[PDB]
Each structure stands twice: as C-alpha cells, then as structure tokens.
C-alpha cells in the first residue's frame, strides 16, 4: 500500500510578494508492479489543473517516490482556504485524500526580545546573542539575523514550543566572535509573521 | 506485514536513581488471522527473560499492536550496552532485528548561563527568565527551575538542537509575575546530564 504525505508552504514564502508559496504532495511506497500515479487537486472543493508534477524517482529500497507541487496564492493560504490532494493508484481500491490548511484560531502577534550574552560567557572565544520570540499564533514564523544591513548566518533557532496560554515561543542563538561584540557592532534579530504589522519586526542588540 | 519500532528510555529515566528506565518494542499491523507474537530480548547478545509484555492492542483499522517493555539498569545504558528486540510472527518469513543503544560519541558536559528578562519585558505583568544550556553531548538532559528549593511550575524548555560543532543546546523559559522578579527573589536553573561529575550543576539568576 502506497502512502501520501501533504506539506505546507514555507512561512516566509507566504508573506512576501517576491516569493512563490507551494503545497507539496508526496507519494511513497509506489510499487514497480503499479508505478502509475494520478494526482487531482482541489482548492476548497474546486478542482485545479495548475499543479506541476515531477517524474517518479526510485529510492534505495527499490520503491518509487512521486511528488506533485501546487503553487498557491498568498492570500488564499492566509485566509484559510483548504487544499486537498487526491491520489489514485491501481494497488489501491479507492483514492487517498489528504487535506491541509493554515491552522485555525485567532492570530496573535509575536513579542520580540533580544538578550545579551551572559557575563559568564565572556571568558569563551565566541559569545551567544539570544532572540526570544513569544506569544504568537499560529506557529508559522521566519527568523534571521542581520548586521550593518547584510545577513548573519551563524545562528540556529529552536522549533516553536507550545506555551501554557495556547501561544508559541522559540529562541534563536546567533554566535559571533566575541572580539566583534566588545568592539561594539550592532546586530538585529529580524522576524516575519502574519500577525505583525507589515508582516515584520526587528530588535537590535549591541554592547 | 507487521512493522517494528524500538524506542530508547525517556531522558529523565536515565538520569535519576529513583526512576526506572525502559526500552520499548512496538509491533504494529499484526493481522487478525495471526495475532500471536513472540518477543526475544538480547543484552549485548546474551538473552534476558526480564521483560514484561502487555496484552494485544486492537486498533481503529482492525489491526493488532503489541508492546513489550524491558526495564534496564542505568549503568548498562550509560556504559553503552546494546539492546535487541526479536519479533517472530507467522505472517513474517523471517524474524525482525531491531537494536537500540545510547548515543555514541565522547560525552561533553553542559554549560549553564542565565539571562535576565529584557528590560523591555518589564512593562508586562509577567517576565521571562531564560536559561541557556549549551555544549552538551549526548542529547539526554534534565532542566528545571526552582526557588527556595521547591519547584517552579510555570516553565517550558525547548527540544535539544544540534549546534554547528555537533554538540547540543537548548533554552528554558520560566515566567514569573513581574512583581516576583522585583520582589527580589532568587531563581535557579538546575540541570542534570551524564557528563557532570557532581550529579547536578545549577546557576542562579536574580534582580
């Protein structure tokens, strides 16, 4: 029996005019006996013939993986339209249906706070700048760092975590050479979320 | 056919004497025509007869699921012994192999840093006290907050995250009434990890 998994668009892609968001339908465990796969896509019940489909790809374990990618309108996703992938295959008496949507419930705007390196870390060679991001819903969110205008790439951020009030929070840690921080440079934690005004906010951090 | 998954013990369970860590072997998709399964458990290759197996598990899809739990002593696990589950089933041409053990690689002790609430959180009713815990390997760890010795319950901790050098970090967030932090109270971030020498380390944080 084949299996299908349905994936949402990347959070940033849904918030920028310059990006193009997509829902992805992945079909695994497709046999050599029946390698034929048909995709049908329905946006709130209405079929669309706009999905673009990749040729099948055999995996190490001798089964096939087939993926169908549907581009999405930004506002449709933000407004809660339901996206449905319908997969038919002869090893399968009735098609498989999977449906995806943005999460339900009142959006909540993130609060953003930046926290300097701890006092006890200044003996180390590099220091950690922390960005706390809390109180937001749904959990879709984008976080990056910039300095002097350009991006800063030596950072890692945690998955969102469910808080006690129903909101989410996460942390991001940007590590910089601690020569630079005592030198006095300015770094910025930049975050995008649908409940932010103009979709973004930024908070700065300096000695 | 039936499928097998083998799960390690819960992180708290490996770290305190008062708990009993266990390895859990789950078999899903076992048919009604052949519902009986045999479990064989091997500790570094030598069979042990100390595991407890619970009665079958009828699922929504009319399939049976079976779980057997092997309790393990802490020192074996930390010393790297391998645990092996062998599942035999008449609907299975050959028995199944699953083997689990503690994560491999040189252990490294966590570093603990406390970061006070951002001055801008001070307008809120509650403030966030954050504990950055970094540099540790393997990923099993216990993090809690207490004040005056007794525990603190409004806290949340992130999953471990792989840092760029192969070790892990996470953050823990304690929210207290902003009155509480102004009050002058002392809060403590307390952590246990197998690479610590004196069974715990703690760092304090106060106004």
């Amino acid at each position, epitope marked *: 029996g084949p299996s299908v998994f349905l994936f949402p668009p990347k959070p940033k892609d849904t918030l920028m005019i310059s990006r193009t968001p997509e829902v992805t339908c992945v079909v695994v465990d497709v*046999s*050599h*006996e029946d390698p034929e796969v048909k995709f049908n896509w329905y946006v709130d019940g209405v079929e669309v013939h706009n999905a673009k489909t990749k040729p099948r790809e*055999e*995996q*190490y*374990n*001798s089964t096939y993986r087939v993926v169908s990618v549907l581009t999405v309108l930004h506002q449709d996703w933000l407004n809660g339209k339901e996206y449905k992938c319908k997969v038919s295959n002869k090893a399968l008496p009735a098609p498989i249906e999977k449906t995806i949507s943005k999460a339900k419930g009142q959006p909540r705007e993130p609060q953003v706070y930046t926290l300097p390196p701890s006092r006890e870390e200044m003996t180390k060679n590099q220091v950690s700048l922390t960005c706390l991001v809390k109180g937001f819903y749904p959990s879709d969110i984008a976080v990056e760092w910039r300095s002097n205008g350009q991006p800063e790439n030596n950072y890692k951020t945690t998955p969102p975590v469910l808080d006690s009030d129903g909101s989410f929070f996460l942390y991001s840690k940007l590590t910089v050479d601690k020569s630079r921080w005592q030198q006095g440079n300015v770094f910025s934690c930049s975050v995008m979320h649908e409940a932010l005004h103009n979709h973004y906010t930024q908070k700065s951090l300096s000695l | 056919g039936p499928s097998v998954f083998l799960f390690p013990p819960k992180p708290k369970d490996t770290l305190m004497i008062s708990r009993t860590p266990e390895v859990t072997c789950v078999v899903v998709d076992v048919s009604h025509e052949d519902p009986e399964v045999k479990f064989n458990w091997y500790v570094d290759g030598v069979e042990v007869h100390n595991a407890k197996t619970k009665p079958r598990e009828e699922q929504y899809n009319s399939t049976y699921r079976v779980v057997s739990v092997l309790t393990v002593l802490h020192q074996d696990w930390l010393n790297g012994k391998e645990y092996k589950c062998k599942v035999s089933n008449k609907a299975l*041409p*050959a028995p199944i*192999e699953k083997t689990i053990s503690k994560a491999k690689g040189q252990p490294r002790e966590p570093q603990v840093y406390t970061l006070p609430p951002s001055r801008e959180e001070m307008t809120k009713n509650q403030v966030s006290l954050t504990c950055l815990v970094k540099g540790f390997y393997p990923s099993d760890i216990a993090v809690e907050w207490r004040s005056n010795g007794q525990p603190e319950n409004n806290y949340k901790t992130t999953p471990p995250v792989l840092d760029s050098d192969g070790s892990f970090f996470l953050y823990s967030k304690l929210t207290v009434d902003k009155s509480r932090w102004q009050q002058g109270n002392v809060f403590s971030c307390s952590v246990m990890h197998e690479a610590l020498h004196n069974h715990y380390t703690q760092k304090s944080l106060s106004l």
Partner: nanobody
Framework: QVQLQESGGGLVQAGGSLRLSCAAS????????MGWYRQAPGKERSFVAA???????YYADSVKGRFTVSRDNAKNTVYLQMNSLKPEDTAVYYC??????????????WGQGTQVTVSS
C-alpha cells in the same frame, strides 16, 4: 527456505580481477534491493555496492571505478565485478537483500560469505 549463496571467491593477485555471483531463493529477491558487504577479521562490515530493482547503483568510496555491480532481474542473481584488486580488498564477502535508505540499511537476508584473498 530462504537462502543466499555466494560463489566466485578465491585467491587473486594485486591488479587481478574476480567476479562474485550470488543466487537467491525464488521470490525473496523480487522487487527488492541487493547489496554486497565485506568483512575483514577483527574489523566490521563495509558497504561495498548495491543495485535496486530498477537498476540504480550505489558504491562505497573504497571501490568506486574499480568495482561494478550488475543484476539479471529474471535470473535471481547479482554479480560483483571486481577489477584491479588491491591488498585491502581481502575479506569475506556477503550478499544481502536490503531495505531502509542508504544511510540506514535494513538487511532482510544474508548470504553465507566467500573468502577473497589477494597477495602481493
């Protein structure tokens, strides 16, 4: 029952060439992937090569260019064409039926093993 029988090992020389063969019981191989592994004394198992039902091939870095794996789907045998053999190729070689994904194989069945020895 379910068996895998290798054949073709033996004594070969540095720069020589050996061809292993591996025969599977009926069925156990159908629509499944076959791999070659090797084992020197005191050390452990290396991936050597593997080929899928569709014909995709995977090689360990140690043998790329030198070894070539091949398979006749209807004849239930897989081959390991070893060319230009070197001193560390000496080990006992096993064929298998594999699942999982190259980073983590699941071995359904194992062969008995054949010694390959290269002198200098």
């Amino acid at each position: 029952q379910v068996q895998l029988q290798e054949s073709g090992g033996g004594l070969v020389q540095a720069g020589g060439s050996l061809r292993l063969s591996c025969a599977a019981s009926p069925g156990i191989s159908r629509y499944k992937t076959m791999g070659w592994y090797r084992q020197a004394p005191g050390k452990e198992r290396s991936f050597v090569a593997a080929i899928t039902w569709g014909g995709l091939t995977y090689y360990a870095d140690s043998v790329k260019g030198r070894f070539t794996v091949s398979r006749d789907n209807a004849k239930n045998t897989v081959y390991l064409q070893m060319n230009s053999l070197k001193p560390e190729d000496t080990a006992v070689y096993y064929c298998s039926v594999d699942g999982g994904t190259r980073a983590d194989p699941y071995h359904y069945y194992w062969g008995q093993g054949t010694q390959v020895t290269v002198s200098s």
